[PDB]
């Protein structure tokens, strides 16, 4: 109903409701619940044991805790794995005490020492395992729902049963099935995929239904964490629109700084760690100001000056404003250089790269008839010299060197590149004619002694200007 994107952005902000202090700690506790759901669901995964084993191998060569607790508290899950592996895989998979040992392995996981690089690896490995089993189910659906004339409802009732051995394949060749009698015409992909599913199951050491509900718990916890992150970032858009007042200069628009503070607040969500007892606005202020300075350093300038030189030139502008207020006169580079504790040539160098280049549509004249661009000199200049002599000297060499009735002109035209593509040295022109370099040098000196005399090369002499 409007035309400004920032006003309907404010409308979408006003659609959601803000937070009080108790609402802030409630959304922080919802973030904690969304994190800890994945933290306890990953304890039931068999690859977490190998992940903690490679973590113990990484910290073997190593406020903070002592490393002895990292050496001791990263090896009991290996013992639980080697006392569970004789029950979860051997002597049948469907067992109650095997699931009790699985829960015992899961309840000893709280020795986290959380690192954001460590958290990505288990999520990535479980996501590509979920992607592998999902494209396995997708290719099975492509070979069974689309082919052999049976709908999607005749697949899930046999898919949810075992999905381990060959019983589900000839379960789809049921009591009559005249449309699905093509056995060997469809077997060639499905048993090759079932062997891949079986080797995946023997890699994880568990049936496909348990890892299916484990990945469903992963998706549920990730969706709940995403909704908690969404309400956290939506309740704090007043923070970015209230912090974006102090950086409202004419280098960028408002919306780019707002959406950079949005990703700064999104980083501050996972960098919050609310158990210290602080508010989200106070710690998020630093991250959003960092994102705002990063956007005003990378963007808001045609010539992209980096963030450290942006910081030094902002300090130089503040020192120049302070010396303007303390003196009244224009700030010389000497006082700014001695107050910056930097040499003066670096001060003038960062002063040279002062601001965005004058755009092409500024009215430098008296009216709006002639803008900029009608005053720029050509860098690729084509002078009367550069247009006339660059061909007339070529014609003069083609006229004079044609009088050279031997191979000296043929070895001199490739000595510099006249009527040739690649410029050659004496060695490359030697291998064609005269492999000893000094023969070509002596014939070049003879051609020089023939051409340097002001008798017939005076037209070549007049081209020195």
């Amino acid at each position: 109903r409007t035309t400004d994107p920032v006003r309907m952005y404010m409308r979408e902000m006003g659609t959601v409701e803000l937070l009080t202090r108790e609402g802030e700690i409630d959304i922080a506790k919802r973030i904690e619940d969304g994190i800890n759901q994945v933290q306890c669901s990953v304890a039931e995964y068999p690859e977490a044991i190998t992940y903690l084993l490679e973590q113990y191998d990484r910290v073997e060569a190593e406020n903070s805790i002592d490393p002895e607790l990292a050496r001791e508290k990263f090896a009991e899950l290996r013992a639980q794995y080697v006392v569970t592996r004789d029950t979860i895989k051997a002597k049948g998979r469907s067992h109650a005490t095997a699931q009790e040992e699985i829960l015992k392995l899961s309840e000893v996981f709280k020795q986290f020492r959380l690192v954001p690089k460590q958290f990505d690896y288990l999520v990535n490995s479980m996501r590509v395992m979920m992607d592998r089993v999902r494209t396995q189910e997708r290719l099975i659906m492509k070979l069974c729902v689309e082919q052999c004339k049976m709908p999607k409802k005749n697949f899930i009732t046999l898919f949810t049963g075992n999905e381990t051995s060959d019983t589900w394949f000839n379960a789809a060749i049921a009591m009559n099935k005249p449309w699905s009698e093509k056995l060997h015409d469809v077997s060639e992909e499905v048993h090759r995929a079932l062997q891949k599913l079986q080797q995946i199951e023997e890699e994880t050491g568990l049936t496909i239904e348990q890892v299916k509900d484990i990945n469903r718990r992963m998706s549920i916890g990730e969706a709940k964490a995403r909704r908690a992150k969404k309400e956290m970032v939506e309740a704090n858009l007043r923070l970015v629109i209230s912090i974006a007042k102090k950086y409202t200069n004419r280098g960028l628009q408002f919306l780019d700084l707002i959406q950079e503070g949005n990703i700064g607040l999104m980083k501050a969500v996972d960098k919050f760690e609310y158990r210290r007892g602080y508010k989200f606005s106070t710690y998020a202020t630093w991250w959003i100001r960092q994102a705002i300075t990063r956007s005003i350093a990378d963007q808001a300038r045609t010539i992209r000056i980096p963030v450290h030189m942006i910081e030094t030139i902002n300090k130089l502008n503040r020192i120049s404003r302070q010396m303007l207020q303390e003196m009244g006169r224009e700030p010389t580079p000497e006082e700014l250089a001695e107050r910056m504790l930097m040499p003066e040539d670096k001060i003038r160098k960062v002063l040279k790269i002062a601001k965005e280049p004058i755009s092409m549509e500024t009215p430098i004249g008296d009216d709006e008839d002639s803008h900029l661009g009608d005053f720029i000199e050509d860098t690729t200049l084509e002078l009367p010299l550069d247009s006339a002599t660059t061909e007339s000297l070529r014609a003069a060499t083609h006229d004079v060197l044609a009088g050279l009735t031997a191979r000296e002109a043929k070895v001199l035209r490739m000595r510099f590149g006249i009527d040739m593509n690649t410029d050659y040295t004496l060695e490359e022109v030697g291998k064609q004619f005269d492999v000893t370099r000094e023969r070509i040098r002596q014939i070049e000196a003879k051609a020089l002694r023939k051409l340097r005399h002001p008798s017939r090369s005076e037209v070549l002499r007049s081209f020195l200007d």
Binding site: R1, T2, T3, D4, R7, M8, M10, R11
Partner: protein, 50 residues
């Protein structure tokens, strides 16, 4: 004839009826529309005749 075609009658809706004509797209509150009316018509920081 102005009072036969008035969009809103209340003071709130009325004031708001303005906010939509001045700054469209943003649904205002009572205090926001009141502050916009004050700083657009009856504020010394945005209006001076001397």
């Amino acid at each position: 004839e102005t009072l036969r075609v008035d969009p809103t009658n209340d003071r709130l809706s009325a004031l708001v009826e303005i906010y939509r004509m001045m700054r469209p797209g943003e649904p205002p509150t009572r205090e926001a529309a009141e502050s916009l009316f004050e700083n657009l018509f009856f504020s010394e920081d945005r209006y001076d005749l001397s």
